[PDB]
């Protein structure tokens, strides 16, 4: 679990990873529909967080329908939660190959609070699909258009992405 | 304005990247065996 320890540096936030996988089909696949989410763990320190992230494999080699999500401590990773029921993401589509790199890229400037937007961020999710992964950035409030304005010039700062990619932006809400 | 307390930016955080670790207890579970290196 999350101890603060003296020798270590801290985070502004305790972080946890989530992860979830998806057996999307009764005909694509020979076993029935199935979806699985779980915690695994949370971290306080710069020096936990590589005890965790140095040990799963990176998000352009995981198969199948599957997904990292990153969240605050006590965010759930589903837009129902009260911290984000209200808000909503950065999307950015990335064809095969480049999601391990900036899904590093991404949180190591989540984490290290390169964003400075206060407490607005909630986590972030990369999500393995069979011809391209998602990559995405999620905030608690959705009307903020200063907030989300700042987070997509960091993003466009941090992730090191061609200046073609695009990027969107969706309130959870929009969905219903 | 108002800067966070505990800030860290690419280079400082691969600075801390401790090459002998121990893996956490709460990664080994199971479940998590596909994605464990």
Request: with cysteine; glycine share 6%.
């Amino acid at each position: 679990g999350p101890h603060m320890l003296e020798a270590e540096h801290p985070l502004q936030y305790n972080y946890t990873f989530w992860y979830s996988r998806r057996t999307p089909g009764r005909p694509t696949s020979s076993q029935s529909y199935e979806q699985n989410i779980k915690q695994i763990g949370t971290f306080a320190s710069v020096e936990q967080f590589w005890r965790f992230y140095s040990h799963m494999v990176r998000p352009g080699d995981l198969t199948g329908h599957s997904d990292f999500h990153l969240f605050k401590e006590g965010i759930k990773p589903m837009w129902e939660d009260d911290a984000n029921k209200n808000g909503g993401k950065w999307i950015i589509r990335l064809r095969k190959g480049l999601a391990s790199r900036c899904w590093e890229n991404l949180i190591l400037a989540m984490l290290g609070e390169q964003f400075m937007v206060g407490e607005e961020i909630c986590g972030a999710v990369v999500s393995v699909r069979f011809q391209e992964d998602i990559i995405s950035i999620w905030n608690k409030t959705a009307s903020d258009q200063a907030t989300t304005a700042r987070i997509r010039d960091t993003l466009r700062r941090v992730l090191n992405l061609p200046p073609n990619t695009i990027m969107e932006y969706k309130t959870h809400t929009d969905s219903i | 304005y108002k800067l966070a307390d505990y800030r860290y930016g690419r280079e400082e955080m691969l600075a801390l990247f401790l090459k002998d670790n121990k893996i956490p207890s709460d990664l080994l579970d199971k479940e998590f065996l596909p994605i464990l290196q």
